Ligand binder design. Sequence first.
Ligand SMILES: *[C@@H]1O[C@H](CO)[C@@H](O[C@@H]2O[C@H](CO)[C@@H](O[C@@H]3O[C@H](CO)[C@@H](O)[C@H](O)[C@@H]3O)[C@H](O)[C@H]2NC(C)=O)[C@H](O)[C@H]1NC(C)=O
Ligand SMILES: *[C@@H]1O[C@H](CO)[C@@H](O[C@@H]2O[C@H](CO)[C@@H](O[C@@H]3O[C@H](CO)[C@@H](O)[C@H](O)[C@@H]3O)[C@H](O)[C@H]2NC(C)=O)[C@H](O)[C@H]1NC(C)=O
Lengths: 52, 262, 52, 49, 49
Amino acid sequence: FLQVSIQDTRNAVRACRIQYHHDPQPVGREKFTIRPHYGKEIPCTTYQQTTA
Amino acid sequence: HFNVYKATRPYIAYCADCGAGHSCHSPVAIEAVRSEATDGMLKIQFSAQIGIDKSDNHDYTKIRYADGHAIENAVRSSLKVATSGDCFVHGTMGHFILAKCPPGEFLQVSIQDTRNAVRACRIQYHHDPQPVGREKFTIRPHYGKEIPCTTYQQTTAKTVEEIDMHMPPDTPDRTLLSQQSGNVKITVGGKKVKYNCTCGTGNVGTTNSDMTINTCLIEQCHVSVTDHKKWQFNSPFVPRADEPARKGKVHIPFPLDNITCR
Amino acid sequence: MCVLANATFPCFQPPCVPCCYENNAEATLRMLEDNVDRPGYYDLLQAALTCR
Amino acid sequence: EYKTVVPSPYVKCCGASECSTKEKPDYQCKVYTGVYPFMWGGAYCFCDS
Amino acid sequence: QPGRFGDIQSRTVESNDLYANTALKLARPSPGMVHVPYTQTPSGFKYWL
Ligand SMILES: *[C@@H]1O[C@H](CO)[C@@H](O[C@@H]2O[C@H](CO)[C@@H](O[C@@H]3O[C@H](CO)[C@@H](O)[C@H](O)[C@@H]3O)[C@H](O)[C@H]2NC(C)=O)[C@H](O)[C@H]1NC(C)=O
Ligand SMILES: *[C@@H]1O[C@H](CO)[C@@H](O[C@@H]2O[C@H](CO)[C@@H](O[C@@H]3O[C@H](CO)[C@@H](O)[C@H](O)[C@@H]3O)[C@H](O)[C@H]2NC(C)=O)[C@H](O)[C@H]1NC(C)=O
C-alpha cells in the first residue's frame, strides 16, 4: 500500500491511503538493491525534473 | 591520559549512493562491516570518527567529521543507523559503532551537517541473524535455558587488534586560484600548497604565502594541500603518497568476548 | 629496543620525552612509522603521545 | 574465514611504476596505464594520459 | 580448492605459514575513479557452515 499525508492548518494530519502492489525490479539480469562502485552502464528510463 | 585520537583525522571518501541514488564524496562513507558476533551485533566503520570533538578532547556530544581539509563537529544526536527497519546503537568509539538491527537487505548511517543537512551513505548488506540454539526465536523469554555465546564488549582496554594508518596525500583544490588580470593568487591560511605551472621557466615548489605568477592564466597552475601533521587511514578509496608505503598502527575498540544467552 | 637513524634506544624511554607530539608532530609520526616492524612498537606509541 | 587486505592505490603522476613480487598468501599485483583520477576538490596528476 | 571447505589452510592456530587459494583477481579501475576493483570467490568455511 501507500499513503500521503501532511499537517493541516490546525496541525492535524490529513491522510489518504490507497492499495498498491509495489515491487520494482532493476534493469538487467540481476535483482540487486543498491548500485555498486564497479559495474556496467545499462540504459534505462526515468522521470526528469524539467517542467518544459 | 593517552588520547591516541589526537594524531588521527576524519577523511572524505567515496560513497556509492548517498541516500538518493546519486553518488558523491561524503564524509560518512561506510567501510567494512564486521558481524562475527553470535548474538547478532554489527560493527560498522565510518570515515568520520565520533566521540572526539574538534579540539581532540573526549566528548559524548560532538563528533569529528572532515569538511574540505577542515574539521568541524556535529551533535551526537541525529546519528541514525538503519536497515529495512530501524537499529539501536549500543556502543560508540572512534570510527566504530555497535548496533542491533532487524533483518534487511541494506543499511545506511547518517548524521546532520553543520547546517542541519543530512549526510548519508548506504551499502548493500544481507543481514539475517539467527539465535544460538535449536529454536529461531525472536526475543528472549522470561523462563529458559542459558546457552553460551559471544558478543562485542563495550570496554576499550588493550585489545590486540590492528588498523593501518598512513600519511594523507596531497589534496588537489582549484578554489584557491584567483585569476584577476593576467595574474594569479594562491590562498593561504595554514595550508602549505604545492604548485606546478608550466609557464616559462621553473615555477614549482611549495609556499606559505600569497604569490603571483603574472605570466599565464590558471589553466596550468595547480594547488595541492600538503597537510603532513597527522595520520588519516589506509583506505582503498584514498590514494597513497610513497611507493613503499609508510604505515602505522592503532588499536580498535570493542573486542569480542564470551557471554551467555537465554 | 626502538631505533632512530643511529640512536638504538629502549622504546620505554624515547629521547623526545616529554610531549613528543606537541613539540614536533611530523617528527613523532615519522619516528613511529619507522618502528612498525619492531615488537616494541606499542610501548613507543604509549610513550610518544603521553604528556601532561 | 579469510580476510582480504586491499592497501591504498599508489597513483603515479607523470611517470610509470613497475610490479614487484612478494611472498604473501595469494598475492596479486598489477599496473594500469592511462588513469586520470578525480577527487572532491579536482583532478590531480596534471599529465592527461 | 576455492569456494569449498579448506580454501585456506593453516598447520596450527598460531602457525605463521598459510596456504590460500581463493581465485582473487584484480580488474581495471573505472575512468576517473580511485577504487581498486577486485573479485574473489566467497569463503569456503562460511559455505561449509
Ligand atoms: C609539472 O607538470 C609538467 C607538465 O608537463 C610535467 O612535465 C612532464 O614531465 C614528465 C617527466 O619528466 C615528462 O615525461 C617524459 O616524457 C618524455 C617524452 O617527451 C619521455 O621520453 C620521458 O621518459 C618522460 O616520460 C612529460 O613529457 C612532461 N610534460 C610534457 C608536456 O612534456 C612535470 O614533470 C611536472 N613537475 C612536477 C614537479 O610535478
Ligand atoms: C570463550 O571460551 C572458550 C573456552 O574457555 C575460549 O576457547 C579457549 O580459549 C583459550 C584462550 O586462552 C584457549 O587456550 C589456548 O590453549 C592452547 C593449547 O596449547 C595454548 O597453547 C594457548 O596458549 C591458549 O592457552 C583454549 O584452547 C580455547 N578452547 C577451549 C578451552 O576449549 C574462547 O576463546 C572464548 N571466546 C573468546 C575469548 O572470545
